[PDB]
């Protein structure tokens, strides 16, 4: 998921660096339940 870009014209002005910055370690339990009121 890329970072929040600035004004795209300012991004073009800044260049490739402001483009560059954007882009089983720990177990976990999980769930989901889908219900209709």
């Amino acid at each position: 998921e890329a970072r929040d870009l600035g004004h795209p014209g300012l991004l073009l002005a800044y260049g490739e660096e402001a483009w560059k910055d954007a882009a089983n370690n720990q177990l976990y339990h999980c769930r989901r339940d889908e219900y209709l009121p």
Binding site: H29, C30, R31, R32, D33, E34, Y35
Partner: peptide, 19 residues
């Protein structure tokens, strides 16, 4: 949310007694 594991529940993440 319902703490009980009712028929409403869809996943169920548990261990086997083997484990």
């Amino acid at each position: 949310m319902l703490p009980f594991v009712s028929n409403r529940t869809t996943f169920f993440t548990r261990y086997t007694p083997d484990d």
